[PDB]
Design an enzyme around this catalytic site. Sequence first.
Site, PDB file in Angstrom:
ATOM      1  N   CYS A 210     -18.152 -15.922  25.549  1.00 43.57           N
ATOM      2  CA  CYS A 210     -17.972 -16.528  24.354  1.00 43.57           C
ATOM      3  C   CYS A 210     -18.626 -15.593  23.451  1.00 43.57           C
ATOM      4  CB  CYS A 210     -18.999 -17.660  24.054  1.00 43.57           C
ATOM      5  SG  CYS A 210     -20.586 -17.586  24.732  1.00 43.57           S
ATOM      6  N   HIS A 254     -23.709 -21.024  24.431  1.00 38.79           N
ATOM      7  CA  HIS A 254     -22.322 -20.865  23.841  1.00 38.79           C
ATOM      8  C   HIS A 254     -22.774 -20.089  22.661  1.00 38.79           C
ATOM      9  CE1 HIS A 254     -18.106 -21.540  23.890  1.00 38.79           C
ATOM     10  NE2 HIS A 254     -18.134 -22.295  22.839  1.00 38.79           N
ATOM     11  N   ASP A 270     -14.246 -22.465  17.018  1.00 36.26           N
ATOM     12  CA  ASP A 270     -14.812 -21.846  18.209  1.00 36.26           C
ATOM     13  C   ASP A 270     -13.349 -21.275  19.003  1.00 36.26           C
ATOM     14  OD1 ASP A 270     -15.551 -21.144  20.764  1.00 36.26           O
ATOM     15  OD2 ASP A 270     -15.982 -23.236  21.192  1.00 36.26           O
TER      16      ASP A 270
END
EC number: 2.3.2.13
Length: 288
Positions: A210, A254, A270
């Site tokens: 991520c 994350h 995201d």
Amino acid sequence: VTGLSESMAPGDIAELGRSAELAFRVRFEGALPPREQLYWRALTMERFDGRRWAQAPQWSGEDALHWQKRGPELRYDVIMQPSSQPWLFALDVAQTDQTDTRLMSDFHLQRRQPVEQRLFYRVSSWPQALRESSIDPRTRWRNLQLPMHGNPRARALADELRQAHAQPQALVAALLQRFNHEPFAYTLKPPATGADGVDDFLFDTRSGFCAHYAGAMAFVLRAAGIPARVVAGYQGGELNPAGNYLLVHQFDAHAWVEYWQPEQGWLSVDPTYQVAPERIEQGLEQAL
Ligand SMILES: [Cl-]
């Protein structure tokens, strides 16, 4: 004490992806929100040095120029494990009953001391809150910061996107589309990159976890003249139906993005969702 820290290089969150230590537990007053909404903000990282994203100093965000409540209020209680860091985890935009904790200018909760013992706290969040519709000039400037040198390919992409898309929302969509259509891999064992790490990831390896995706997207937005920052925390959680609570382990760590535009203020996005939607909809250990 394993956990998020104030900085991260692409690869560093993947190391948490490999830890099953518990981070916190959560009990909601009502129904559990859908997994896609379970973005647990810890902090923002506004400084990029060409390798690592890092936290900047903040001031108070608990005022009406900062934000406006709108939409549903979500109420929940948290028990946090020791983090050795001064951040409380919560869905944006959060308020707590902790008198030693303040909502800062970047919409994260800063405690006066690091959490070194288990801590229970009560939260109210407004996920639809309007955030900074008028931006402080210092915040704007800070969130356009890049090194002058390094990652020329990504800067060229940002230039091309800026010329093609006048409206920030359109530029953001075009960038998300690149992740969606190109053969990007979401992995806990990303390949090493060289000094031009953003270029190497976007155009060579197309493989990361991520922090690769969030950091590269924030880089390109800033290079296109859109204020943007990396948001770090956790996403998702594991339901314990025997106890009626959610567990959030370190593997749920994350990183994502928020960007600013006039009137709409900060909006979160995201890029991981474009490559590994199952991660978001199912949780990492049901995907990776
Ligand atoms: Cl990572």
